[PDB]
Amino acid sequence: MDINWRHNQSTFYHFTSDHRISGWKETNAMYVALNSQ
Amino acid sequence: MIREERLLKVLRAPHVSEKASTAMEKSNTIVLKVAKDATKAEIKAAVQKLFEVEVEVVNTLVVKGKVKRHGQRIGRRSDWKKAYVTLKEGQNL
Amino acid sequence: AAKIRRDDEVIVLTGKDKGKRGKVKNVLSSGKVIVEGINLVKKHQKPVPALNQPGGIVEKEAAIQVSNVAIFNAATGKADRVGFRFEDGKKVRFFKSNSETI
Amino acid sequence: MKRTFQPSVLKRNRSHGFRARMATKNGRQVLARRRAKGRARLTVSK
Amino acid sequence: SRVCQVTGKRPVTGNNRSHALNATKRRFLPNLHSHRFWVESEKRFVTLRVSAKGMRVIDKKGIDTVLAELRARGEKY
Amino acid sequence: MKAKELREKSVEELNTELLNLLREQFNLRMQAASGQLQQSHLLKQVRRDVARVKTLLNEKAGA
RNA sequence: UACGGUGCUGAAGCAACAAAUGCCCUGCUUCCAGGAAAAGCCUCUAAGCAUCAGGUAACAUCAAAUCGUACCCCAAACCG
RNA sequence: CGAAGGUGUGCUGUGAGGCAUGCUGGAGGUAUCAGAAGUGCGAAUGCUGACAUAAGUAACGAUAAAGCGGGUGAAAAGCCCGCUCGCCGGAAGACCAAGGGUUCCUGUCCAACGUUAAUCGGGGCAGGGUGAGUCGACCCCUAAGGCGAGGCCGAAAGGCGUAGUCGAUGGGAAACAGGUUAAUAUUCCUGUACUUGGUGUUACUGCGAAGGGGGGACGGAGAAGGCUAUGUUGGCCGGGCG
RNA sequence: AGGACCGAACCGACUAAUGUUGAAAAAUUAGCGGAUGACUUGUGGCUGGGGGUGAAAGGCCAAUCAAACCGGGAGAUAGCU
RNA sequence: UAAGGUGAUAUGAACCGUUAUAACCGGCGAUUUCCGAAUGGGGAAACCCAGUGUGUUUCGACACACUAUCAUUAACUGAAUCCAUAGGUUAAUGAGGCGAACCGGGGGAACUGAAACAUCUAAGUACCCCGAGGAAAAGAAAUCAACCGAGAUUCCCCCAGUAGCGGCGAGCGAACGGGGAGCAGCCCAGAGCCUGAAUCAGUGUGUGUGUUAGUGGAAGCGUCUGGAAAGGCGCGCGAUACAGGGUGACAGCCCCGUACACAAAAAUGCACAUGCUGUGAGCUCGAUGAGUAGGGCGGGACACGUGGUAUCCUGUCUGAAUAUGGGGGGACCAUCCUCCAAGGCUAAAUACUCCUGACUGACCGAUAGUGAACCAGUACCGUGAGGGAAAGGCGAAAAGAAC
């Protein structure tokens, strides 16, 4: 359980996805930034 | 011919179970654990010459070893080989 | 070699049995000895459903250290240290203090 | 969805197996580092 | 490889320098040509990959002495 | 038994070789694995005794 | 009948019609975009061997080793 | 006759601090005066472990659906048996390949695992279980492609490649019906078969290759014709007359 | 006959709604396009990082791509926090 | 060596042994499956398939041995072609692969610094590759010096952050000379005289010493607290032994040891001596390293960035003199001094620690010290290269809790 918890905390450490906050969290930040311009 | 020094090392134990038992008491076949590298000619010759009976035909399967564990330490057992030795009409053992 | 050995009579120097004599039952390669009637522990063991079931509190002897015993002189009647001399190509033990071969 | 690891034993061995690490200079250096690090299984064979 | 079989001339390395002195790596190559040398003592043509001053030293030392050197150092011709 | 095996001929260590394997070894594997054979030390001493016969047999034959 | 079953016995066992995307069919027709290889298989001989060896046919006899074989497999057993 | 440490109390110094002592602890501590520092933490979206918070809150993973009787049990909505009800039925049935690797079957246990309970389980423990001349692999042959004696090439490592040698997803010998195990079956048993090699005898006889020829040897589409699997109906046979 | 027509398997992904600490790190449901072809699919093989491949989007190259991943130079450098 | 043993978790069962053929320790042997350079062919490592020869009183099947490639040498064969070479076959010898650092050589970055950046730096570093040894390399003046002299190479301390080099920026940075460690010289290019003359190398033997098992090894009791004494108190003894560890609290005298004195059947390392084989001393005379030195062009190394740049190395084109000669002495010339290139060998001082032994620490003590005190390069993660944990302590003794 401890090994699975360390690896499953280590899941989104090297991500790329920009529309999702922290790799996973859905948001509207594309529209927020885009409307700020 | 097969040398007798080879031919003694092949048979290893008689196999006791209920499939073995019904094979003896129903179809003349004695089931026995053999050497892992033992061919059917060696098992046939070794039952011909070590229990002095007449063997009709041998059928050999190989049984895979079970991964057991002690405590939190695993281990596979060990593969062995099982020979279904079908005797002729005149036999005892 | 070994100073205290198997069929030998010793006296106990330290603890719970200080001054008690007794014969060495056996001698364990931990550097311990079991000496009869000396280090009595009160084990109590379960009556296993296999071969015979004693149950109860069995009073065994425990292993004491080899350094806690010394072999009994009986010519002086006290504890005595052991040396090793050669006699006729035999490495014999001997009592110190009167120099007697055992 | 079709994930990336679609296993095949024959491609596992032809690709990353022992006879294929030993087949060249740099795979032998791979085996040398795995032995030197001291590793229970060197290649992926079985 | 580009080695003269007589003089043993490998390609060496160096720099293209420029007017601004920018160092770049280059290779100097030997003038290797594959020439076919008549040997009178054996009555044959032995073809070698010589430099263009392996031919100078064959013209001076003679082809027999040179082949004795190649046979001496295990260079197979 | 180490000098005793050392003082026979090659043919006689082949005889007691085949009798260590034949009579002793096989009958004790069959007897051991069929619930019989209280005395298990026999397996060990037979096995080491075959090691002695093969040792002296290799030492006697040639080098 | 340890009601889980276990043995014994066991009649008729035909015809008509419909019918495949399976089989004849690696066929047939056609079309350009013109549709693997090598062995087994059958044959021809060269060097050689030639009243021998080998080939064919019949009969008899021996052999056919080794490894896989459980179980899931559109899934609670594989990849997620 | 009780050290370090821990936890209180009392006294004391301007402070960092010091001193004494009750209880826990159970074996080490160290004056003074010097010496050396991994020498003092509340912050670094600090690192590691522990524990809170929201909070006994959202959720408990297809809206295919359950109801009752009986059994086992310490306990039954969930397990087993029975009767009903619903769902899939070109699949949510059956058989494999790949992949996994004992999950299979039996007995036994309910700690943890199972998003609940569990007597149940793909969970724990033990025992059992996989039977081949004909199925598949190995094997013979090759495609793409790999490797490659020599060789050509390249600072070295190495690149390419001839002969060759490997490489199936392709070509090449042969078994079917019925029965059986809790668990295997074209493998075991019953019946009836077939294939390829070795050896021996007998009769006839020209045999002989990393060589020649044939064959293997192979497209898309379409169209019917002849069949069969299979199904439907009648006849027959057994049973029912509700 | 047909890069022919309608339409299942099969390949895809146009719209909407749900979902967005999901049942799911890209799906479900209801409709939707192709469906004998420039189709689709299984098994194997080949191409590799300033390189591949690209019916071209800077797309894809193991949930990573205006230059992959791993290890090293390496405690880069940081007039900044 | 031995009275106890059959390795651990890990108890049992069945036994072996006690004065020597239990067990344990050491020397030398024997066996040493399969994979792996893997070597008979192949292959998805630990598997599949052979050929050849020898033997097998049931030789209808078994057992054993050999069969890789390459280099060198030899034998027998052998094309186009006559001779012959290429090629082919067989045999003998050697190699191949792994390994932590040190060493030599072939290639060789960039981030960075210059407060930008390009010359420069980083840096001939990282890394890749080849090769070798217990060390390697270098080495016996065509070297300095300076009109006096020194005398091979290597390493250390100065010289000296000096002279210089330098977008004369950032930076780079000597030598001469001095003090030490260590010290060793030789051979071929070549004939005669003369022989085994020193020399080493390979081996036998003998001696000495060391390694691989070991042996002996001093000396204490009473009483109080206490669960227990090694502690307190009292009185003794050892010490060439009070290094250390254990023992129920802190032991010189309880145990193992320590100081000290001894021990090897066998295998070995080193050093002398000696036998044989190979090898050559010494004398006279002669020779005394040519596509080379030097040059032109391009590049590199020298502290030296082409600059007034000596010197060394060479990719390319050339090209001498050869002891009445030639190289150097920091452009260059003359005078003077010094040395003899174009062939080679050479110990010691020196560098390093995969590995073994002993000892030591104002090193750490379980978030520290190795990533790893514990079955850790494990679990686990990743296709892969690779990444990579957490986790010690009952008690003095299991007496580990009968009922």
Short mmCIF file of N, CA, C and O (backbone and C1' of nucleotides) in Angstrom, two decimals, chain J residues 329-349:
data_model
loop_
_atom_site.label_atom_id
_atom_site.label_comp_id
_atom_site.label_asym_id
_atom_site.label_seq_id
_atom_site.Cartn_x
_atom_site.Cartn_y
_atom_site.Cartn_z
P G J 329 68.32 27.52 -31.61
"O5'" G J 329 69.24 28.11 -30.46
"C5'" G J 329 68.91 27.86 -29.08
"C4'" G J 329 70.08 28.15 -28.14
"C3'" G J 329 70.54 29.58 -28.15
"O3'" G J 329 69.75 30.35 -27.27
"C1'" G J 329 72.43 28.16 -28.34
P G J 330 68.92 31.62 -27.84
"O5'" G J 330 67.72 30.96 -28.63
"C5'" G J 330 67.56 31.30 -30.00
"C4'" G J 330 66.30 32.05 -30.27
"C3'" G J 330 66.20 33.44 -29.68
"O3'" G J 330 65.61 34.29 -30.63
"C1'" G J 330 64.36 32.14 -28.98
P A J 331 66.50 35.18 -31.59
"O5'" A J 331 65.95 34.85 -33.05
"C5'" A J 331 64.78 34.08 -33.25
"C4'" A J 331 64.10 34.43 -34.54
"C3'" A J 331 64.93 34.25 -35.80
"O3'" A J 331 64.94 32.91 -36.24
"C1'" A J 331 63.84 36.36 -35.86
P C J 332 66.28 32.24 -36.83
"O5'" C J 332 66.97 33.40 -37.63
"C5'" C J 332 66.70 33.67 -38.98
"C4'" C J 332 67.65 34.77 -39.40
"C3'" C J 332 69.13 34.46 -39.22
"O3'" C J 332 69.66 33.62 -40.25
"C1'" C J 332 68.67 36.61 -38.41
P C J 333 70.89 32.71 -39.96
"O5'" C J 333 72.13 33.70 -40.10
"C5'" C J 333 72.41 34.31 -41.35
"C4'" C J 333 73.55 35.28 -41.17
"C3'" C J 333 74.82 34.76 -40.50
"O3'" C J 333 75.68 34.05 -41.37
"C1'" C J 333 74.25 36.84 -39.58
P A J 334 76.56 32.87 -40.82
"O5'" A J 334 77.77 33.64 -40.13
"C5'" A J 334 78.81 34.29 -40.89
"C4'" A J 334 79.68 35.12 -39.97
"C3'" A J 334 80.42 34.34 -38.90
"O3'" A J 334 81.65 33.82 -39.37
"C1'" A J 334 79.36 36.20 -37.92
P U J 335 82.22 32.47 -38.80
"O5'" U J 335 82.73 32.87 -37.33
"C5'" U J 335 83.94 33.62 -37.11
"C4'" U J 335 84.11 34.02 -35.67
"C3'" U J 335 84.23 32.88 -34.66
"O3'" U J 335 85.53 32.35 -34.52
"C1'" U J 335 82.65 34.45 -33.87
P C J 336 85.73 30.80 -34.17
"O5'" C J 336 85.19 30.65 -32.68
"C5'" C J 336 85.97 30.99 -31.52
"C4'" C J 336 85.09 30.98 -30.28
"C3'" C J 336 84.61 29.62 -29.78
"O3'" C J 336 85.56 28.94 -28.96
"C1'" C J 336 82.76 31.09 -29.87
P C J 337 85.54 27.33 -28.90
"O5'" C J 337 84.29 26.96 -28.01
"C5'" C J 337 84.29 27.25 -26.63
"C4'" C J 337 82.91 27.00 -26.07
"C3'" C J 337 82.38 25.57 -26.11
"O3'" C J 337 82.81 24.84 -24.98
"C1'" C J 337 80.71 27.06 -26.86
P U J 338 83.06 23.29 -25.05
"O5'" U J 338 81.63 22.73 -25.42
"C5'" U J 338 80.75 22.52 -24.32
"C4'" U J 338 79.37 22.19 -24.78
"C3'" U J 338 79.17 20.83 -25.42
"O3'" U J 338 79.07 19.79 -24.47
"C1'" U J 338 78.09 22.49 -26.70
P C J 339 79.56 18.39 -24.83
"O5'" C J 339 78.50 17.83 -25.87
"C5'" C J 339 77.29 17.22 -25.42
"C4'" C J 339 76.31 17.13 -26.55
"C3'" C J 339 76.56 16.04 -27.58
"O3'" C J 339 76.05 14.78 -27.18
"C1'" C J 339 76.09 18.07 -28.69
P C J 340 76.60 13.45 -27.85
"O5'" C J 340 75.96 13.41 -29.30
"C5'" C J 340 74.55 13.30 -29.51
"C4'" C J 340 74.29 12.98 -30.95
"C3'" C J 340 74.92 11.69 -31.47
"O3'" C J 340 74.03 10.68 -31.97
"C1'" C J 340 75.60 13.55 -32.81
P A J 341 73.08 10.82 -33.25
"O5'" A J 341 71.87 11.74 -32.78
"C5'" A J 341 70.63 11.16 -32.34
"C4'" A J 341 69.43 11.74 -33.09
"C3'" A J 341 68.86 10.87 -34.21
"O3'" A J 341 67.96 9.88 -33.73
"C1'" A J 341 69.13 13.05 -35.00
P A J 342 68.11 8.41 -34.26
"O5'" A J 342 67.41 8.47 -35.69
"C5'" A J 342 66.02 8.82 -35.83
"C4'" A J 342 65.71 9.19 -37.26
"C3'" A J 342 66.06 8.16 -38.31
"O3'" A J 342 65.07 7.16 -38.47
"C1'" A J 342 66.91 10.23 -38.99
P G J 343 65.51 5.64 -38.82
"O5'" G J 343 65.08 4.87 -37.51
"C5'" G J 343 65.89 4.88 -36.31
"C4'" G J 343 65.99 3.47 -35.84
"C3'" G J 343 65.49 3.18 -34.45
"O3'" G J 343 64.08 3.03 -34.34
"C1'" G J 343 67.56 2.20 -34.71
P G J 344 63.40 3.48 -33.00
"O5'" G J 344 63.91 2.41 -31.92
"C5'" G J 344 63.39 1.06 -31.92
"C4'" G J 344 64.23 0.15 -31.06
"C3'" G J 344 64.09 0.26 -29.55
"O3'" G J 344 62.92 -0.32 -29.02
"C1'" G J 344 66.33 0.02 -30.08
P C J 345 62.38 0.19 -27.65
"O5'" C J 345 63.24 -0.60 -26.58
"C5'" C J 345 63.17 -2.02 -26.47
"C4'" C J 345 64.15 -2.51 -25.44
"C3'" C J 345 63.98 -2.00 -24.03
"O3'" C J 345 62.94 -2.66 -23.33
"C1'" C J 345 66.26 -1.93 -24.59
P U J 346 62.12 -1.86 -22.23
"O5'" U J 346 63.22 -1.56 -21.12
"C5'" U J 346 63.66 -2.59 -20.20
"C4'" U J 346 64.81 -2.10 -19.37
"C3'" U J 346 64.51 -0.96 -18.38
"O3'" U J 346 63.94 -1.43 -17.17
"C1'" U J 346 66.51 -0.48 -19.52
P A J 347 62.60 -0.81 -16.63
"O5'" A J 347 62.78 -0.95 -15.04
"C5'" A J 347 62.73 -2.23 -14.35
"C4'" A J 347 63.57 -2.19 -13.10
"C3'" A J 347 63.15 -1.17 -12.04
"O3'" A J 347 62.17 -1.70 -11.16
"C1'" A J 347 65.49 -1.07 -12.41
P A J 348 61.02 -0.77 -10.58
"O5'" A J 348 61.79 0.19 -9.58
"C5'" A J 348 62.33 -0.25 -8.31
"C4'" A J 348 63.06 0.90 -7.64
"C3'" A J 348 62.25 2.19 -7.52
"O3'" A J 348 61.49 2.19 -6.32
"C1'" A J 348 64.39 2.66 -8.44
P A J 349 59.95 2.53 -6.35
"O5'" A J 349 59.90 4.07 -5.94
"C5'" A J 349 60.56 4.57 -4.75
"C4'" A J 349 61.10 5.95 -5.02
"C3'" A J 349 60.07 6.99 -5.51
"O3'" A J 349 59.41 7.61 -4.40
"C1'" A J 349 62.02 7.07 -6.84
#
